[PDB]
Structure 1
């Protein structure tokens, strides 16, 4: 068990899938390098920047309480109890940043609403979370999957992919995502050959059995995926084992992640993926690349990350001059949303501070007893330009506390020796794509 507790005048809770789900029985597995560690560090980086900002919360130091979810909603609920213990060692929590997986964000939201704690997700896209009658303290820097499903149905309609197979991860992301896709597909006269579900529970079929079901309909060469990152790897690995070749059309769960395709680049060649439209935070790259196990002792998972990333041991022995750089690192696509989520919470607290304490820069008596209801409704639904790092760059929430439906379309290609994801299109309300730039496995 591990955590990050940095004391401050106001403390922000944080939830990241630092570790994957453990195999068989174990709660926690391997370190999730890109969607775990990087995202965690993007929150720490944003907190550091805000604490250096003389225009945003001067006189109010932001502390943190960051916990691992181990990519499980059950594990995340146990961890989330620590954020509410001080309302029932435990510190008071102003707001919560996370989680990543929609199921954990849902579980956490069910608990947090009972303590009027505002919650901002930087990656949870389930349309379920747009229900304000149920998730009254929830907001997100990301859009609902109502739009991603539409974007995917429009891609198939554009290429006349009228007879397709679907595979979905069981849970809050995959099931509602594919249900939304199936409605949009039907409105566009797109038929579904087979609809498979994957996941761990006793009711699911094997990944090899799912691949066998996909090959049983050779007519459907395009497979639409609304799946989790961990489930996506298992499916590809299964496709690779039986040398199954399909044109994968995948949601943000896969996105532009190299971890899903490393080792099985052949079986995933020509894949079309979506990811939320984002731009890299250049200052984060500088910050992340400067981290090493000798200077980073506030992150208790950093040593495990380092040993996994570089295939090492401390006390092959880890070389002292090992460094995170452009040769072994790429900024995770949703980092922009993590920084924006921390900044959204900061801007809402600054505005409440300037309203309730006009006489000081400090946490006045009128603000010591924080009103989560008012913080959420009267402040958090605000407006700001993307955090002192950016060249619609405004951070805001709609009536439902959601971000804007903007996606980038990617194609898994070879470029020039190196396998990568090339941006080949965009979706904002309509689909735009550069068809000539796409490589489909073998030509077409």
Structure 2
């Protein structure tokens, strides 16, 4: 094939693109001793599909009169290789001067001219953090189709970072609203051993205290089935959860971690609970294909509602065919893209097509940049103010208050560079011969539940709540990972409660007696 040649195209304004368009062998994991070129010989289809989405968006924009009339939009794409060094090389090339392979250390950039107008950012949060500082120093507008870490919202450190996938905070807010709706006030929270694994739990624990939910228990779970000591940790976690009298569990972990935990729970039986999933662990094939999943109980989770791109697969097939055509030569950034075969991947992976709405997110990012440029040029339906060349820092002023029409949706960037988005709530009916998912409700900044469609193990809603208030005759004693709720104790006869918020009960004197829950003694 001749396909690596097609990741660059001419135009009046050029978009940069960082994609997971390659990978490196494990031998690269050692400490580098000499600054030689890092090999990235290992193919990645995900990056290919994302780059094709960007190309399709730019082609649509170049054909229509609705955006940027009478001028051509260009691009050139690079592989991040999931490697910070290669990513840094790519970004430094992006900020180099027009027509030159070098970047300037000036003090004043009042007439500097870098070669790209905007950069469509990387697929992972680590590289997003690494590149965002650099890009946002220069006020280069950057748009990420997948970087959900909350830390990226900070406008002080990332003044020019935008994304078209919601932050994790919105998903956890939806979960918290779901917990409030059923008054599932007393909960246990689990996550993976990795950074994301407790970043999620930190955000959830911060959210819970602001709204009442009592995080009774916290912990991390491994994704390493062979690690016997960490399996000891998971056994301890499950015994603790069972001992806590909790009935609802929030589980932010990765798919394999949940698979391990649930398999162990199957074998030693555990007890049924309500498990609340995450975009990471949802529609999980391995988890749903458990031998006897019924021992788990109810399973729920929120999932993003990305719009359709019906023409995408035919576009990919068409362009792979064109890359196979020997005449098309008349028309590396990816070494294996020229080797990879046509049929099986492009068919099967797009039939298997998480991937779909990230493709849509890339498309929407391209459209966001195009609409921002359209506003900045103040284009008419047939005019633009082309007397000047728009510098990147001039887009940034116009990108915060825009709205862009991605396909059928209308979208905006909020004050923190995060898009408005809505979720479906999906629940597992596990009792059919194979488990089935149903859309129990939706979240659009507020939660709507179709109560009539849900199922429960006892045909009645499970409960976990703990008391916070107590009667004037009841002693209060703290419980919870935080001091959020109290289990009331009715003081026994022969003792009295001296005042309604004391934490102990006092015996009566020998000449006196008292009934239960009394505040006083009688002779």
Is TM (by shorter chain) over 0.5? Answer: yes
**Quick one: distance in 2 between partners of 1:214 and 1:179?**
18
Q: 1:49 aligns with which of 53, 60, 80?
A: 60
2:215 — aligned with what? 191
Shift of 1:102: 2.7
Q: Would the aligned equivalents of 1:285 and 1:331 in 2 still touch at CA under 8 Å?
A: no
Q: Across the two proteins, how many residue pairs are aligned to each other?
A: 414
Q: 1:395 aligns with which of 393, 408, 411?
A: 411
1:12 aligns with 2:15: yes
- Structure 1 pair 68–300 and aligned structure 2 pair: CA distance change class (3 A): closer
1:310 — aligned with what? none
Q: Would the aligned equivalents of 2:275 and 2:299 in 1 still touch at CA under 8 Å?
A: yes
Q: Would the aligned equivalents of 2:69 and 2:381 in 1 still touch at CA under 8 Å?
A: no
**Quick one: distance in 2 between partners of 1:416 and 1:117?**
52
1:134 aligns with 2:157: yes
**Quick one: distance in 1 between partners of 2:371 and 2:129?**
24
- Structure 1 pair 331–206 and aligned structure 2 pair: CA distance change class (3 A): same
Q: Would the aligned equivalents of 1:125 and 1:143 in 2 still touch at CA under 8 Å?
A: yes
- Structure 1 pair 46–205 and aligned structure 2 pair: CA distance change class (3 A): farther
Aligned 1:173-188 pairs, distance under 5 A: 173-186=196-209, 187-188=211-212
Aligned 1:44-443 pairs, distance under 5 A: 44-71=55-82, 76-86=87-97, 92-159=115-182, 160=184, 162-168=186-192, 170-171=194-195, 173-186=196-209, 187-196=211-220, 208=231, 211-219=234-242, 222-227=248-253, 232-239=254-261, 242=264, 248-256=275-283, 271-288=299-316, 290=317, 293-296=320-323, 300=334, 323-324=347-348, 328-329=352-353, 332-354=356-378, 364=386, 366-367=388-389, 370-379=390-399, 381-384=401-404, 386-387=405-406, 389-390=407-408, 393-404=409-420, 406-412=422-428, 421-435=437-451, 437-438=453-454
Deviations 1:271-304 (A, max 9, x none): 422233332233335435x358544579948859
**Quick one: distance in 2 between partners of 1:20 and 1:225?**
30
- Structure 1 pair 330–179 and aligned structure 2 pair: CA distance change class (3 A): closer
- Structure 1 pair 225–18 and aligned structure 2 pair: CA distance change class (3 A): farther
Q: Would the aligned equivalents of 1:177 and 1:226 in 2 still touch at CA under 8 Å?
A: yes
- Structure 1 pair 403–330 and aligned structure 2 pair: CA distance change class (3 A): closer
Deviations 1:368-406 (A, max 9, x none): xx422221113453123x33x32xx32221222221253
SS at match of 1:216: helix
- Structure 1 pair 442–217 and aligned structure 2 pair: CA distance change class (3 A): farther
Moved more, 293-302 or 35-44: 293-302
Q: Which runs of 5+ in 1 are unaligned?
A: 307-313
Q: TM-score under structure 2 normalisation? A: 0.64
Q: TM-score under structure 1 normalisation? A: 0.74
SS at match of 2:377: helix
Q: Which runs of 5+ in 2 are unaligned?
A: 30-38, 103-113, 325-331, 463-523
Shift of 1:424: 2.3
Q: Would the aligned equivalents of 1:118 and 1:138 in 2 still touch at CA under 8 Å?
A: yes
**Quick one: distance in 2 between partners of 1:416 and 1:37?**
38
**Quick one: distance in 2 between partners of 1:175 and 1:421?**
27
Rg (Cα) greater in structure:
2
Shift of 1:136: 0.9
**Quick one: distance in 1 between partners of 2:118 and 2:248?**
42
Moved more, 394-403 or 13-22: 13-22
SS at match of 2:7: strand
SS at match of 1:332: helix
SS at match of 1:146: helix
**Quick one: distance in 2 between partners of 1:442 and 1:22?**
52
SS at match of 2:420: coil
**Quick one: distance in 2 between partners of 1:291 and 1:441?**
50
